[PDB]
Write a protein that binds this DNA or RNA. Structure first.
Ligand SMILES: OC[C@H]1O[C@H](O[C@H]2[C@H](O)[C@@H](O)[C@@H](O[C@H]3[C@H](O)[C@@H](O)[C@@H](O[C@H]4[C@H](O)[C@@H](O)[C@@H](O)O[C@@H]4CO)O[C@@H]3CO)O[C@@H]2CO)[C@H](O)[C@@H](O)[C@@H]1O
Lengths: 365, 97
RNA sequence: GACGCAGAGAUGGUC
RNA sequence: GACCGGAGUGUC
């Protein structure tokens, strides 16, 4: 008679635990919040053996693959509840017409910059090479961001036309993949260009990029709302704005929707509904989670209305709109792992851009 | 759907029910596939999974407590584990495992 | 026929 | 207590 929740390490997991305390103090149910590494990779392998958790948190994309394997519980919220959360956020958590998880927030990457090292942030990517030499005089870099997960380099590869799966009359064509198109190459090339022209090291990851921006060592970074709290505490004067345009076109970040699905095999599915519906998805819950690590654009209308004024969320909302919503199909996993290796190998040297993307073009199906 | 597959193995081929009986079948390597109910205690699903591991036998995890297993195998009492020996017209060892 | 035990091995056996 | 044994079986 307990609820074991697995949430990602770069989220408000202490603040989600804080919501579990109210749930304990009001029923005596043990709400255990864990944040295990590679959780999205683990949940499928551990639920096939019946040793998984009750509630799992992740962006809507990894949930369709689970649903296709029957690892997710058919969530059953009433008509009144559905009209509390945005009609678009439910669509992100729908597999084969059935709702498989509860939407919690709309995520979107934005250009985070140091107002002290850069009052007017770049409007385009094409000016960054210059701005870097200018800052190399003051012994500082211009742009530092994680190049190990494709999610951060995707806004650039997608900008000029790159895509995952072609969307047609509702269904996604798993055979039409836009990672090899002329536009995709250009953007991935540009990334590899700043890399080759010593403007951005090809070994930089989340831990490094976060450290540099937060310690005043670089003008800007590309990150999500989660990374705000740690920036707020570094006492750095910073802003959250639109991503730079590449080839006179907007960057198209892959918009996630922090969903919370239930384990189809869980015995305490009934308790999960009470928790997620009447203790988390409310102005009180989201707030405690948002106070730990910001969610930004929230799925719940009530609390969203409150936070809207924040100019940081304005950016998130801006980028979220200018980009595209992540497909929830099972084939997303392949495309991701596939693009993962393209951005790395391409920038490392192993394969050239054309080679890296040509391989992802195939490995993606 | 598998509930029909189980039933089938029970009219044509041999099976066995219960903890004691299956562990024996694992030791003898006579069982091919085992089936353990969802909310089976930990020591036990560990001890089963363990003989299934030593015996090099496959394991299927039922999406419903022993209560529904008994119902699914033609019994009234609860059965937390099923050792499938040979399957006649049924295909659970050659389709899902 | 209700309760109680009973494949998570019952009653029942044998040392 | 240990072992054997596999579907019933004790009560009113
Ligand atoms: O190749 C080895 C690596 O494998 C693992 O990385 C995988 C993920 O497991 C996949 O799920 C996928 O990643 C996507 C992710 O699914 C998707 O939601 C999106 O995730 C963002 C998300 O918006 C947000 O919640 C935030 O927390 O960050 C995520 C990005 O880190 O985008 C991901 C793409 O990066 O593909 C990756 C690999 O490409 C494993 O986690 C790695 O540690 C391992 O090295």
């Amino acid at each position: 008679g307990k609820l074991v929740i697995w949430i990602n390490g770069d989220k408000g997991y202490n603040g989600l635990a804080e919501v579990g305390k109210k749930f304990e103090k009001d029923t005596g149910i043990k709400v255990t919040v864990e944040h295990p590494d590679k959780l999205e990779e683990k949940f499928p392998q551990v639920a096939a053996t019946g040793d998984g958790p009750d509630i799992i948190f992740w962006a809507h994309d990894r949930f369709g693959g689970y649903a296709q394997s029957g690892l997710l519980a058919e969530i059953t919220p009433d008509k009144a509840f559905q009209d509390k959360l945005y009609p678009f956020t439910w669509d992100a958590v729908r597999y084969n017409g059935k709702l498989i998880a509860y939407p919690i927030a709309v995520e979107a990457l934005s250009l985070i910059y140091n107002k002290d090292l850069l009052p007017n942030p770049p409007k385009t990517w094409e000016e960054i090479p210059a701005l870097d030499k200018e800052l190399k005089a003051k012994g500082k870099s211009a742009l530092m961001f994680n190049l190990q997960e494709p999610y951060f380099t995707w806004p650039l590869i997608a900008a000029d036309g790159g895509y995952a799966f072609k969307y047609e009359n509702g269904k996604y064509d798993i055979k039409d993949v836009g990672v090899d198109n002329a536009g995709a190459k250009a953007g991935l090339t540009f990334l590899v260009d700043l890399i080759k022209n010593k403007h951005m090291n090809a070994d930089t990851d989340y831990s490094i990029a976060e450290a540099a921006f937060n310690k005043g060592e670089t003008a800007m970074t590309i990150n999500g709302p989660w990374a705000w709290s740690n920036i707020d505490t570094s006492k750095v004067n910073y802003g959250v704005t639109v991503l730079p345009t590449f080839k006179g076109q907007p960057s198209k970040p892959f918009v996630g929707v922090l969903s919370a699905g239930i384990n189809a095999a869980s015995p305490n599915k009934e308790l999960a509904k009470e928790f997620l519906e009447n203790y988390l998805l409310t102005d009180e819950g989201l707030e405690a989670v948002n106070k730990d690590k910001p969610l930004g654009a929230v799925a719940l209308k009530s609390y969203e209305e409150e936070l809207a004024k924040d100019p940081r969320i304005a950016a998130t909302m801006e980028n979220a709109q200018k980009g595209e919503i992540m497909p929830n199909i099972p084939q997303m996993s392949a495309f991701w792992y596939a693009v993962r290796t393209a951005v790395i190998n391409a920038a490392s040297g192993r394969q050239t851009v054309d080679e890296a993307l040509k391989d992802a073009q195939t490995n993606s199906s | 759907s598998i509930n029909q597959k189980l039933a089938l193995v029970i009219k044509s081929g041999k099976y066995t029910l219960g903890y004691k009986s299956t562990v024996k079948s694992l030791r003898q390597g006579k069982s091919k596939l085992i089936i353990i109910a969802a909310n089976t205690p930990v020591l036990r699903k560990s001890e089963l999974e363990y003989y299934a591991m030593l015996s090099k036998t496959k394991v299927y995890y039922f999406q419903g407590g022993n209560n529904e297993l008994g119902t699914a195998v033609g019994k009234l009492f609860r059965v937390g584990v099923v050792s499938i020996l040979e399957a006649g017209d049924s295909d659970i060892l050659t389709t899902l495992a």
